[PDB]
Amino acid sequence: KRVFVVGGHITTFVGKGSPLFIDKKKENKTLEELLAESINGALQNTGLHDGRAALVDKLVVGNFLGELFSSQGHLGPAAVGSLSNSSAFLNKPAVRVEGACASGGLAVQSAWEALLAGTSQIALAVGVEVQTTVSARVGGDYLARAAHYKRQRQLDDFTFPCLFARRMKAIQEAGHFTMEDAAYVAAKAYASGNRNPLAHMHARKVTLDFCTQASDKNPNFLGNEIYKPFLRTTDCSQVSDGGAAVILASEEGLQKLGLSPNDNRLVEIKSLASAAGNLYEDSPDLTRMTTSMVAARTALSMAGVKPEQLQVAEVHDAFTIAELLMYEALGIAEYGGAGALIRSGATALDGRIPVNTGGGLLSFGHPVGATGVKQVLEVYRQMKGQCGEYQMKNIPGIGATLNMGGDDKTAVSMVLTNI
Amino acid sequence: KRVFVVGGHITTFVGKGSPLFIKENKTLEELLAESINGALQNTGLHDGRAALVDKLVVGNFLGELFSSQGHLGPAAVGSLSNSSAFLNKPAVRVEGACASGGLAVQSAWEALLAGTSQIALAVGVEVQTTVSARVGGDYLARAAHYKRQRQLDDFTFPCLFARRMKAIQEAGHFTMEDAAYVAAKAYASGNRNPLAHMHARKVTLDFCTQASDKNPNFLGNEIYKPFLRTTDCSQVSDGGAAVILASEEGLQKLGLSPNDNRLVEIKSLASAAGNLYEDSPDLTRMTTSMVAARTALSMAGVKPEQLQVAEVHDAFTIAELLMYEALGIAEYGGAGALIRSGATALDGRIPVNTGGGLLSFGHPVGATGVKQVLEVYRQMKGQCGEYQMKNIPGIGATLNMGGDDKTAVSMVLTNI
Numbered sequence: 001k002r003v004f005v006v007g008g009h010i011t012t013f014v015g016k017g018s019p020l021f022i023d024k025k026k027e028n029k030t031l032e033e034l035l036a037e038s039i040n041g042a043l044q045n046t047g048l049h050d051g052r053a054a055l056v057d058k059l060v061v062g063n064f065l066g067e068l069f070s071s072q073g074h075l076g077p078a079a080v081g082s083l084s085n086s087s088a089f090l091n092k093p094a095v096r097v098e099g100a101c102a103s104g105g106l107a108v109q110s111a112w113e114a115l116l117a118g119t120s121q122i123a124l125a126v127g128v129e130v131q132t133t134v135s136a137r138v139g140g141d142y143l144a145r146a147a148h149y150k151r152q153r154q155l156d157d158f159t160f161p162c163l164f165a166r167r168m169k170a171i172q173e174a175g176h177f178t179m180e181d182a183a184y185v186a187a188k189a190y191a192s193g194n195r196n197p198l199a200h201m202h203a204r205k206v207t208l209d210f211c212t213q214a215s216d217k218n219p220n221f222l223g224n225e226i227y228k229p230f231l232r233t234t235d236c237s238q239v240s241d242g243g244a245a246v247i248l249a250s251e252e253g254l255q256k257l258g259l260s261p262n263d264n265r266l267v268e269i270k271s272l273a274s275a276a277g278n279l280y281e282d283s284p285d286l287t288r289m290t291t292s293m294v295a296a297r298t299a300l301s302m303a304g305v306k307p308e309q310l311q312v313a314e315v316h317d318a319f320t321i322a323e324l325l326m327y328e329a330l331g332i333a334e335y336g337g338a339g340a341l342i343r344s345g346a347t348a349l350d351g352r353i354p355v356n357t358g359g360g361l362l363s364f365g366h367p368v369g370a371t372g373v374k375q376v377l378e379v380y381r382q383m384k385g386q387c388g389e390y391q392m393k394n395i396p397g398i399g400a401t402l403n404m405g406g407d408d409k410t411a412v413s414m415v416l417t418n419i
Numbered sequence: 420k421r422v423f424v425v426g427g428h429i430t431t432f433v434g435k436g437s438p439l440f441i442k443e444n445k446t447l448e449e450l451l452a453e454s455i456n457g458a459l460q461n462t463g464l465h466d467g468r469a470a471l472v473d474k475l476v477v478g479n480f481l482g483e484l485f486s487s488q489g490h491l492g493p494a495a496v497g498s499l500s501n502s503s504a505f506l507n508k509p510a511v512r513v514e515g516a517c518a519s520g521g522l523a524v525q526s527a528w529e530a531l532l533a534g535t536s537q538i539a540l541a542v543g544v545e546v547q548t549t550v551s552a553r554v555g556g557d558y559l560a561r562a563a564h565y566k567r568q569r570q571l572d573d574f575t576f577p578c579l580f581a582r583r584m585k586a587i588q589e590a591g592h593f594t595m596e597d598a599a600y601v602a603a604k605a606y607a608s609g610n611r612n613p614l615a616h617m618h619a620r621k622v623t624l625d626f627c628t629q630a631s632d633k634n635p636n637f638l639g640n641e642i643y644k645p646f647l648r649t650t651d652c653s654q655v656s657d658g659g660a661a662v663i664l665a666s667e668e669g670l671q672k673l674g675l676s677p678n679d680n681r682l683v684e685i686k687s688l689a690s691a692a693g694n695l696y697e698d699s700p701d702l703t704r705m706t707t708s709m710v711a712a713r714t715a716l717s718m719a720g721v722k723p724e725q726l727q728v729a730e731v732h733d734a735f736t737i738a739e740l741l742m743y744e745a746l747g748i749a750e751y752g753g754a755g756a757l758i759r760s761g762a763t764a765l766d767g768r769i770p771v772n773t774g775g776g777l778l779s780f781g782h783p784v785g786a787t788g789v790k791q792v793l794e795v796y797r798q799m800k801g802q803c804g805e806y807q808m809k810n811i812p813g814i815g816a817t818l819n820m821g822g823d824d825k826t827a828v829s830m831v832l833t834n835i
Contacts, residue, residue: 001534032566032696059692066561067483071569073561074516077692077707077825091710093690094826095522096514100490106511110526116533118420145482145489150448153487274509276475276493280448291493294507409493410510 002261003112003269004254005416008246008377009041013200013365015132015240029241031070031130036082038243038370039126046247047257051088055256056247057120059094062107062127064369068142069130079126093120100146101316102403103127104244104372105274105412111248112272121253127374128243129367139239143368146406147279156223161231163282163407164321165222168230170286177324179230181339183212185320186234186362188347193363195349195390200238200365235319237361244370246377261419267380267399271415273299279409289322289408292329299413300331300400307331311396312382313355314375316404320362326355330402330413349392357382357390372412375401379416421677422528422685423670424832427662427793428457432616432781434548434656445657447486447546452498454659454786455542462663463673467504471672472663473536475510478523478543480785484558485546495542509536516562517732518819519543520660520788521690521828527664528688537669543790544659545783555655559784562822563695572639577647579698579823580737581638584646586702593740595646597755599628601736602650602778604763609779611765611806616654616781651735653777660786662793677835683796683815687831689715695825705738705824708745715829716747716816723747727812728798729771730791732820736778742771746818746829765808773798773806788828791817795832 011034014020022028029037043049061075076094083089099106104127111123131139143160144153155162172179187208193199210218211234222228251261261268275294283290300307310332317323324342327333332353333341345351358364358378361371379399381387399416430453433439445453459465477491492510499505515522520543527539547555559576560569571578588595603624609615626634627650638644667677677684691710699706716723726748733739740758743749748769749757761767774780774794777787795815797803815832 030566064489065483067481067558070565071557071561072565073480073514074563074695074822074825076515076522077695077821080692081694081696087694090693091691091707093525094515094692095525098489098512098514099492099510106492109509109511110529113526113529113533113535116535117529118532119529141487142483145487147490149486149488150446274511275507276496276510277506278497278503279490279493280497291507405493406490409490 001116002251003115003272004249005267005269005376005380006247006249006265007042007045008380009038009045010198010374010377011037011243012198013238013240013242013367015200015238018200019203028132031066031128032082034128034130034241034243035079035126038128038245039079039082042124042126042245042247053083053089055122056092056124058111058114058123059092060107060110060123060125061094061096062104062125062369062372063096064098064100064103064129065142066130069133099410100406101318101368102372102405102410102412103369104374105401105403106372108246108373108376109272109274109412115248115250122247122249124245124247125373126243126245127367127370127372129369130241131239132241136239158222161236161319162222162224162227164235164319165224165227165231167286168321169227171321174287176287176336177338180212181324182235182320183208184339184342185323186211189356189360189362192349192357192390193359196358196364197389199359199363200240201363235321237318237366240365240367242365242367242370244374244377246373265384267383267416268419269414269416271299271303271305273413275411276405277409279406282407289325289329291405291408292402292411292413295411295413296329297331300415303415303417305398305415309398310353310400311394311398312379312392313353313400314378315355315402316371316375317361318404322404326402330400349390354392357392358387372403376414376416383416383418420532421667422531422688423665424683424685424792424796425663425665425681426458426461427796428454428461429614429790429793430454430659431614432654432656432658432783434616434654437616438619444548447482447544448498450544450546450657450659451495451542454544454661455495455498458540458542458661458663469499469505471538472508472540474527474530474539475508476523476526476539476541477510477512478520478541478785478788479512480514480516480519480545481558482546485549515826516822517734517784518788518821518826518828519785520790521817521819522788524662524789524792525688525690525828531664531666538663538665540661540663541789542659542661543783543786543788545785546657547655548657552655574638577652577735578638578640578643580651580735581640581643581647583702584737585643587737590703592703592752593754596628597740598651598736599624600755600758601739602627605772605776605778608765608773608806609775612774612780613805615775615779616656617779651737653734653782656781656783658781658783658786660790660793662789681800683799683832684835685830685832687715687719687721689829691827692821693825695822698823705741705745707821707824708818708827708829711827711829712745713747716831719831719833721814721831725814726769726816727810727814728795728808729769729816730794731771731818732787732791733777734820738820742818746816765806770808773808774803788819792830792832799832799834
């Protein structure tokens with residue numbers, strides 16, 4: 001019973017705001033291409049790039065949307081397809097999973113499940129998404145496929161960020177953290193995105209006083225004219241294309257690789273949980289995310305990892321406001337105080353536990369289904385030294401992940417131990 | 420290493436053609452409400468004894484536009500409401516075009532042997548009764564290259580076979596007339612099933628052939644247009660189909676044993692996926708299903724001629740005739756003959772799609788996958804009713820389809 005990480009390549013993330021945008025200056029990167037980049041490079045890192053593909057036992061696709069973003073689904077066998085002497089690989093099991101945002105961690109969970117079962121010996125997981133297609137207010141209409149469209153659409157054409165735009169005021173009506181605490185997040189996040197080469201919002205960074213209110217270039221944009229002012233553009237994560245694939249193996253599979261559970265290139269995983277809460281009912285604790293807590297305190301407790309021993313984390317914060325409800329679930333911190341221990345440097349690349357060091361969903365990119373997988377690779381690149389530039393001298397042998405689903409209606413967390 | 424089946428309830432399937440058509444029609448939220456509450460009920464649990472279902476898998480294929488809503492994993496956690504306590508258990512949603520059901524079961528199957536879970540549930544469902552029929556096929560092209568296969572027609576989905584309809588007529592494997600004895604037989608078996616979509620219909624063979632007008636084609640590919648009928652198109656149908664699964668380790672808590680006269684075991688389960696950027700050069704063959712077959716049962720070494728009852732995911736009669744070539748119960752070079760040997764009928768060797776199949780039972784894309792596993796369960800234990808076969812088995816099989824044979828899931832159900 002041992003789950004391993006052996007590699008995985010992450011693509012460049014694009015969108016408006018990233019000068020890597022095309023507008024009838026060419027034909028932008030397609031979902032078929034976005035997965036082409038993601039997996040060919042995921043293979044390449046691993047000791048195989050040719051007919052040595054024929055050993056990948058299980059394929060899992062963590063796509064969330066494409067039935068309208070590319071008007072096309074069934075991405076399982078699409079992973080079988082995009083290799084093209086480089087097309088031989090076919091007729092291997094392949095599924096597609098969905099969990100709104102945690103579509104990536106769920107995919108890894110499928111291979112995770114596939115691993116211990118004996119279904120497969122060496123598997124791959126692949127996250128990807130394409131939100132750069134058309135209208136921005138229309139895109140949120142297709143993101144309400146995470147919450148009750150029947151009960152939560154009669155709010156606005158921007159109904160998705162409203163769950164937090166209301167939690168933005170629900171928290172201001174509390175003494176846990178302030179609107180000003182939601183400011184020190186973006187600048188820090190946008191800064192970390194300035195360190196990452198392939199970051200979506202790589203070429204931007206402003207003063208804290210601007211990631212606060214008193215702004216106009218980065219304000220809200222909503223329609224809920226009472227919850228409208230209760231968000232900023234600094235809160236909305238990045239509408240971003242981009243893939244993020246990963247290869248996984250077994251101890252039994254290791255023998256064929258010519259490896260051993262020791263190699264200075266792999267990272268092991270011994271704790272992995274998951275959870276899902278009702279979406280027909282929203283949190284009575286608008287000042288809490290409960291589904292992530294289960295996925296945390298249950299996961300690592302299998303490995304009994306003391307959260308204060310954590311060295312580097314990655315979270316699926318859809319929003320800065322959601323980012324501040326992370327460390328309450330991820331037991332590395334506690335409750336009753338959020339926007340203080342963040343300025344203890346326990347979030348920064350030069351401190352206790354640097355979180356979202358590549359920029360996170362604010363500047364790294366948020367390809368809904370590729371955001372899930374990438375974190376597992378974000379704590380891999382630093383635990384082995386591949387992040388580059390934004391590589392931390394603070395070296396770990398312990399990591400963690402945190403995936404989000406809707407309004408904390410699905411959660412996936414992990415423990416990455418450098419065995 | 421033992422996979423079991425312990426129960427599962429299938430809903431009424433509706434649509435145009437079924438007089439159960441409408442009030443405000445049954446919603447996907449309701450379609451899963453019926454499916455799981457009844458899936459629980461059969462099994463020795465309907466209350467707080469839900470809190471033992473370790474893993475939840477959702478085999479929905481479409482809802483992001485059929486109900487403009489996804490994330491059906493935690494939606495399964497939601498629809499219980501003293502009857503809402505169940506929350507905070509793992510739940511995923513899977514997709515594989517049509518084989519979305521078998522893939523879901525595969526996830527729990529995987530979840531079982533892993534030790535992820537001890538007692539799991541799988542649930543298929545779909546809602547294709549929303550709006551326009553020519554518009555619905557536009558949302559079913561999410562199984563094939565919309566970029567390479569949409570410039571054909573607004574009815575582009577049934578064209579893969581409407582072309583295979585002529586590709587096979589240009590061959591000596593089977594004829595257009597062999598694709599006729601299927602529907603009547605299928606529509607007949609659907610007349611035996613109470614909850615069948617197209618339950619209240621059945622015509623003469625001479626009508627499931629051409630020379631018809633009430634059941635003709637309807638396409639736009641004016642050259643491949645005549646090469647299909649309405650008897651071929653499977654049923655645009657709402658309906659859920661849920662199932663509970665367990666482990667030998669889980670069995671001890673149930674108060675059961677791997678013997679019970681209520682359960683069915685599974686010892687063979689495979690899966691496969693082929694490129695959709697490339698279509699079959701053998702338009703007279705489906706290759707992905709063959710792997711899922713000859714690899715699956717070979718784990719249990721089951722001799723296909725010992726098979727007693729099958730269920731297949733035939734999207735079309737034409738696809739139904741390419742089933743027994745993969746499901747090794749029959750062979751190649753002859754298709755529309757051994758079917759009239761009674762080796763498809765409820766009173767013969769291997770009755771297949773005895774409830775009517777995707778032509779009369781219903782085709783809720785994601786619930787069609789799961790239901791077969793329950794279609795060979797109800798007859799192997801005696802729950803089909805009416806259309807229950809005296810020919811009693813201790814061996815069964817499934818066959819799930821994905822796109823144009825781009826995904827396949829097959830099983831072996833042995834009554835242990």
